[PDB]
Amino acid sequence: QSPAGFAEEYIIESIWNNRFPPGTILPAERELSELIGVTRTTLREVLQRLARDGWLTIQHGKPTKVNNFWETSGLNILETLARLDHESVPQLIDNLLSVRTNISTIFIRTAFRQHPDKAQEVLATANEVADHADAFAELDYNIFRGLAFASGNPIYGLILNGMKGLYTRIGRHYFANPEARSLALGFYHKLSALCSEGAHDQVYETVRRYGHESGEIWHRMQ
Amino acid sequence: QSPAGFAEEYIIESIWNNRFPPGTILPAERELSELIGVTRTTLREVLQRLARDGWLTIQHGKPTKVNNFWETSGLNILETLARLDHESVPQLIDNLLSVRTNISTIFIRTAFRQHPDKAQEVLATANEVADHADAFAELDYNIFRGLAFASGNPIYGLILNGMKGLYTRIGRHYFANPEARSLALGFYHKLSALCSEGAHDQVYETVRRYGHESGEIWHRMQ
């Protein structure tokens, strides 16, 4: 664990446990570097990283503000969030999968209507996949992301990019179960057929059923 | 424009114009600081910021990689994206509003079912609003974000947080039109009535119609 890593983790934990409460000004840099035990330049790089992720707000000639991350942070904090509240992780994971399922009903339908060639290309990558957890987790994430971009609206893609960290961490655990891998292959294959048939109005129900059934398998593993 | 601001903007522009192509290694720090004209510590803080936003990948003892931001960046780059490709902005804006509309059909319905008290509280803030662009832009963003969190699934909220920058910039221009302000007040009021009535299945069509009609007003302003 680098001096920077140690400092970033210390400050985030200190915000979470209210040593540095959201809504207040962060202690002076000299005070902080002395408390954490890192150089002022290490601290500055760390504060820059945290600011960019939303934990803090830095202003040219004003004190640094500790933010409530729920107002200023994006999908980027998801893994950190999982790590800080180990007890709420199950809920957080259910929320993420629910977002994946519901927002995908939108972009998968749009991709089938706007760029079916691209959607087919993305879905066809399922034919190669190695039969194991890490390979499926990658595959699954790439298909949802690939379909998001295939909608022709890249903003859905930026959303999947932010979900990646926690999403693939769930996948690596989820796809250790053989049934999870099988239900997913069945899903990608059915998606391709719906795309081929132009069965746009059937995408919603097919994706919702996959969300629910893969959700049942996961809840049982949790 | 600070030395750091200048450097960050230079590197991002250089990636966009392929002086530093995505998929390649970034020039050595001494070389970069000399070219840009900033100190090594300014450069390091800047590289840390860019890495956190996805433009680059930094590894303890390996060269820095220039990323294709479409794979590694999140909703955070939206404004930067608008600034880099002035010609595609119209499309980008249409895509963002479309995402707002379609994903909100999901979280607004969920908020009305799970936390109608909170949804009502959020919607009631429309009663105070000052009759002008900046106030409505803020209001409108706060209502969509407020409803996203009111769904009980905070991940929808993190998504709105990432949309904020570009979303409110569009709003500040959009709500300069009196009709835009009026159609929105009508929308918040109708949303409250649907919430009150438990008319969950009517949320989809009401939000889609608002998306389309506010979209028509905007396209006409563009």
Side-chain angles (χ1 to χ4, degrees), chain A residues 1-29 31-58 61-90 92-215 217-219 221, chain B residues 1-29 31-58 61-90 92-215 217-219 221:
Chain A
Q1 186 189 355
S2 57
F6 177 77
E8 183 178 331
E9 159 166 32
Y10 180 84
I11 293 170
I12 290 166
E13 269 164 31
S14 286
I15 291 172
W16 185 259
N17 69 12
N18 295 300
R19 178 190 301 288
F20 304 146
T24 68
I25 287 175
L26 189 69
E29 300 188 358
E31 202 186 306
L32 271 183
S33 64
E34 218 187 280
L35 169 68
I36 298 169
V38 299
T39 67
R40 298 290 302 271
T41 77
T42 289
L43 217 219
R44 286 163 188 142
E45 294 176 23
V46 163
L47 296 174
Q48 284 295 333
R49 299 201 296 211
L50 294 169
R52 201 51 66 116
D53 287 339
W55 297 102
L56 306 171
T57 285
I58 295 169
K62 317 180 66 174
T64 296
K65 298 162 59 191
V66 177
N67 297 323
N68 187 294
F69 80 99
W70 286 120
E71 307 185 68
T72 51
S73 299
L75 288 185
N76 226 44
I77 52 60
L78 280 180
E79 281 169 290
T80 299
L81 220 294
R83 150 208 137 190
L84 291 162
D85 206 344
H86 275 25
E87 308 324 308
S88 309
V89 161
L92 186 70
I93 288 182
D94 284 337
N95 285 336
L96 179 61
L97 300 192
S98 181
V99 167
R100 178 274 326 268
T101 298
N102 295 308
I103 292 182
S104 69
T105 61
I106 300 167
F107 63 70
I108 289 180
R109 177 174 165 286
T110 301
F112 288 3
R113 283 167 45 69
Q114 303 302 325
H115 303 284
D117 57 338
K118 220 312 159 194
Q120 293 290 19
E121 175 169 62
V122 173
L123 292 158
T125 63
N127 303 324
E128 310 311 342
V129 84
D131 191 38
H132 65 78
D134 296 337
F136 258 76
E138 184 65 22
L139 173 81
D140 180 75
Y141 170 72
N142 286 157
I143 286 191
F144 274 102
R145 171 173 181 280
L147 290 178
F149 274 103
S151 68
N153 186 335
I155 295 179
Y156 284 117
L158 295 181
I159 285 170
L160 257 292
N161 291 345
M163 290 169 59
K164 190 182 183 184
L166 187 52
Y167 188 73
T168 52
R169 180 159 160 63
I170 292 161
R172 282 189 289 283
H173 294 57
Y174 176 66
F175 292 112
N177 180 340
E179 186 185 356
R181 301 198 294 273
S182 168
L183 182 74
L185 288 187
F187 176 58
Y188 311 139
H189 190 271
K190 179 164 187 181
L191 280 188
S192 171
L194 293 182
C195 187
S196 290
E197 299 162 2
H200 309 146
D201 65 333
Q202 278 180 50
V203 169
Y204 187 79
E205 89 179 274
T206 305
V207 172
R208 291 281 294 173
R209 182 170 313 119
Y210 176 70
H212 181 278
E213 295 295 278
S214 61
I217 296 182
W218 170 254
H219 286 166
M221 290 166 77
Chain B
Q1 186 189 355
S2 57
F6 177 77
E8 183 178 331
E9 159 166 32
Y10 180 84
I11 293 170
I12 290 166
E13 269 164 31
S14 286
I15 291 172
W16 185 259
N17 69 12
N18 295 300
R19 178 190 301 288
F20 304 146
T24 68
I25 287 175
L26 189 69
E29 300 188 358
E31 202 186 306
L32 271 183
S33 64
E34 218 187 280
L35 169 68
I36 298 169
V38 298
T39 67
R40 298 290 302 271
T41 77
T42 289
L43 217 219
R44 286 163 188 142
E45 294 176 23
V46 163
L47 296 174
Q48 284 295 333
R49 299 201 296 211
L50 294 169
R52 201 51 66 116
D53 287 339
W55 297 102
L56 306 171
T57 285
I58 295 169
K62 317 180 66 174
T64 296
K65 298 162 59 191
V66 177
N67 297 323
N68 187 294
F69 80 99
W70 286 120
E71 307 185 68
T72 51
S73 299
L75 288 185
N76 226 44
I77 52 60
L78 280 180
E79 281 169 290
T80 299
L81 220 294
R83 150 208 137 190
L84 291 162
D85 206 344
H86 275 25
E87 308 324 308
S88 309
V89 161
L92 186 70
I93 288 182
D94 284 337
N95 285 336
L96 179 61
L97 300 192
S98 181
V99 167
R100 178 274 326 268
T101 298
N102 295 308
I103 292 182
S104 69
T105 61
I106 300 167
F107 63 70
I108 289 180
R109 177 174 165 286
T110 301
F112 288 3
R113 283 167 45 69
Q114 303 302 325
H115 303 284
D117 57 338
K118 220 312 159 194
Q120 293 290 19
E121 175 169 62
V122 173
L123 292 158
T125 63
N127 303 324
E128 310 311 342
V129 84
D131 191 38
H132 65 78
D134 296 337
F136 258 76
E138 184 65 22
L139 173 81
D140 180 75
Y141 170 72
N142 286 157
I143 286 191
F144 274 102
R145 171 173 181 280
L147 290 178
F149 274 103
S151 68
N153 186 335
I155 295 179
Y156 284 117
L158 295 181
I159 285 170
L160 257 292
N161 291 345
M163 290 169 59
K164 190 182 183 184
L166 187 52
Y167 188 73
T168 52
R169 180 159 160 63
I170 292 161
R172 282 189 289 283
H173 294 57
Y174 176 66
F175 292 112
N177 180 340
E179 186 185 356
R181 301 198 294 273
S182 168
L183 182 74
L185 288 187
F187 176 58
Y188 311 139
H189 190 271
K190 179 164 187 181
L191 280 188
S192 171
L194 293 182
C195 187
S196 290
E197 299 162 2
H200 309 146
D201 65 333
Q202 278 180 50
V203 169
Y204 187 79
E205 89 179 274
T206 305
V207 172
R208 291 281 294 173
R209 182 170 313 119
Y210 176 70
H212 181 278
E213 295 295 278
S214 61
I217 296 182
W218 170 254
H219 286 166
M221 290 166 77

